[PDB]
Design an enzyme around this catalytic site. Structure first.
Site, PDB file in Angstrom:
ATOM      1  N   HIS A 174      77.309 -27.636 -37.647  1.00 31.99           N
ATOM      2  CA  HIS A 174      77.033 -26.221 -37.441  1.00 31.99           C
ATOM      3  C   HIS A 174      76.930 -25.467 -38.762  1.00 31.99           C
ATOM      4  O   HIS A 174      76.336 -24.392 -38.820  1.00 31.99           O
ATOM      5  CB  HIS A 174      78.110 -25.584 -36.551  1.00 31.99           C
ATOM      6  CG  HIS A 174      79.426 -25.374 -37.234  1.00 31.99           C
ATOM      7  ND1 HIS A 174      80.475 -26.268 -37.129  1.00 31.99           N
ATOM      8  CD2 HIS A 174      79.877 -24.364 -38.015  1.00 31.99           C
ATOM      9  CE1 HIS A 174      81.504 -25.821 -37.823  1.00 31.99           C
ATOM     10  NE2 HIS A 174      81.168 -24.664 -38.371  1.00 31.99           N
ATOM     11  N   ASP A 226      80.170 -33.018 -34.168  1.00 29.02           N
ATOM     12  CA  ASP A 226      79.874 -31.870 -35.010  1.00 29.02           C
ATOM     13  C   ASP A 226      80.077 -32.233 -36.472  1.00 29.02           C
ATOM     14  O   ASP A 226      80.688 -31.478 -37.226  1.00 29.02           O
ATOM     15  CB  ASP A 226      80.786 -30.699 -34.634  1.00 29.02           C
ATOM     16  CG  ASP A 226      80.516 -29.452 -35.460  1.00 29.02           C
ATOM     17  OD1 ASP A 226      79.408 -29.344 -36.025  1.00 29.02           O
ATOM     18  OD2 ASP A 226      81.414 -28.583 -35.539  1.00 29.02           O
ATOM     19  N   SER A 275      86.485 -24.745 -42.433  1.00 30.68           N
ATOM     20  CA  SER A 275      85.782 -25.585 -41.477  1.00 30.68           C
ATOM     21  C   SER A 275      84.824 -26.506 -42.220  1.00 30.68           C
ATOM     22  O   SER A 275      83.946 -26.045 -42.947  1.00 30.68           O
ATOM     23  CB  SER A 275      85.012 -24.717 -40.481  1.00 30.68           C
ATOM     24  OG  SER A 275      84.578 -25.475 -39.367  1.00 30.68           O
TER      25      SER A 275
END
Lengths: 187, 187, 187
Positions: free
Chosen positions: C50, C80, C142
């Site tokens: 992402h 992901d 992240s």
């Protein structure tokens, strides 16, 4: 790195975690209510009153795979506690308790809940009024155990001033449980 | 378990916590403003400017039970600090400071606030711009001390990018306090 | 105090932090996408899918000051993840990995992200389904590394049940990266 050992509180997990159980309701549907803590070999268990407030049939599930039905011994609204009973087959995992241990502010503590198990780490912010900690306290661990680095029981995780969680001191929890066992709800 | 000792940062609490005070306003009503830190024996105290921004009468309350009235020495808007003064009766608890100590990223730190006292644990996320930590920083500890495991002063907890709290490095805080003492508000 | 040493996980920071990089997009505007982790000397890097989902031009920025352009090797929607490639000038900082190390519940872990760098501390709540931790996991970290007190790689911080963060176990992350390198996106 390969030689040395990671800093870890897995010792306290191995000692305490087997004693923390899942608590369910079986209406007629199987719903997850919350967590709980096996206190002794007689088969008594502590949990939050709000967890078992509307249970048609109460079920308890250990980490080792066993599944008992539990009967409500009694509760205590003021502390939001509740004691359950189950038949103890030979061999029950119980939560390490040290009546001589004096909890100190700054002590490392793990909050152990069983929604698999989830464990969070904090310290004792304020000594018990109730015990405060910055370990996350949530429904997934509400009714579960709070233990120090040795795995000794410091309190019972409870819900109901931000960032801080609450646990009922193990010394108070023991006395309340005893009283409920002796009579039932007490005032 | 009974033999061994729990992992704990109560040592840093015993050394540092006596020096962290409550700060009040006494209008005419007694309101709780925030926390503060006794820096030296002269009786100077550091707190957030926003804590004392609207104080008719400022009162400071130690953990040992003593209660002084404090006068605003001066403030500093940019760092949101403020220095107060009180008469030091023989014996004042002061916040351990080590001017030689170099704060490192990863250092364990306790945030000590006095809304009884509440203490939270974290690490230094980024070294001071201000010092960052993941210890909970809130109004209940805003203006209070951030200290390492030894109890030495690392910063002054402050409010005003999620999950992270801010503290003004003790090295900067010392210099600013000195300047306010010398003159007053400084630019 | 002056004599003793603060409790600290700065050792794990010095070992692991150099390997965690910033990840940018350069459209035509320079935007900050997220963090990433240099896995080996060949110049391969892991990050969240992402983060790089809409990148016109991908740029990577080390802590030592170097700045490379990166090409997307391939991604994996289910986990992901995404692997990037850069030319390795002599000397690349890589994330410490120990294939023999068995992650245990209760292990201390640091989440290292590069939005300067921000580091947060927690434990392994549940061993990987993915690895859970109570270390803050956020966009600022992240795609970054989760490491134990020794600095060994435990997982890749990821986003997407409250108070808990997720990381993809390093053992799974290694295998997925290898597969993407060999072919590209894999099913």
């Amino acid at each position: 790195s390969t030689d040395e050992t990671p800093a870890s509180y897995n010792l306290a997990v191995r000692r305490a975690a087997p004693a923390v159980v899942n608590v369910y309701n079986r209406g007629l549907e199987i719903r997850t209510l919350g967590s709980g803590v096996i206190m002794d070999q007689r088969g008594y268990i502590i949990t939050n009153k709000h967890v078992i407030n509307d249970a048609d049939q109460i079920i308890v599930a250990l980490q080792d795979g066993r599944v008992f039905e539990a009967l409500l011994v009694g509760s205590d609204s003021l502390t939001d506690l509740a004691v359950l009973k189950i038949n103890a087959t030979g061999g029950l995992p119980t939560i390490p308790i040290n009546a001589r241990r004096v909890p100190h502010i700054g002590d490392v503590v793990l909050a152990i809940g069983n929604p698999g198990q989830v464990i969070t780490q904090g310290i004792i912010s304020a000594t018990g009024n109730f015990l405060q900690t910055d370990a996350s306290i949530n429904p997934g661990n509400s009714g579960g155990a709070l233990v120090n680095s040795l795995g000794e029981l410091m309190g019972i995780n409870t819900l109901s001033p931000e960032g801080i969680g609450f646990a009922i001191p193990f010394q108070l929890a023991t006395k309340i449980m005893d009283k409920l066992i002796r009579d039932g709800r007490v005032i």
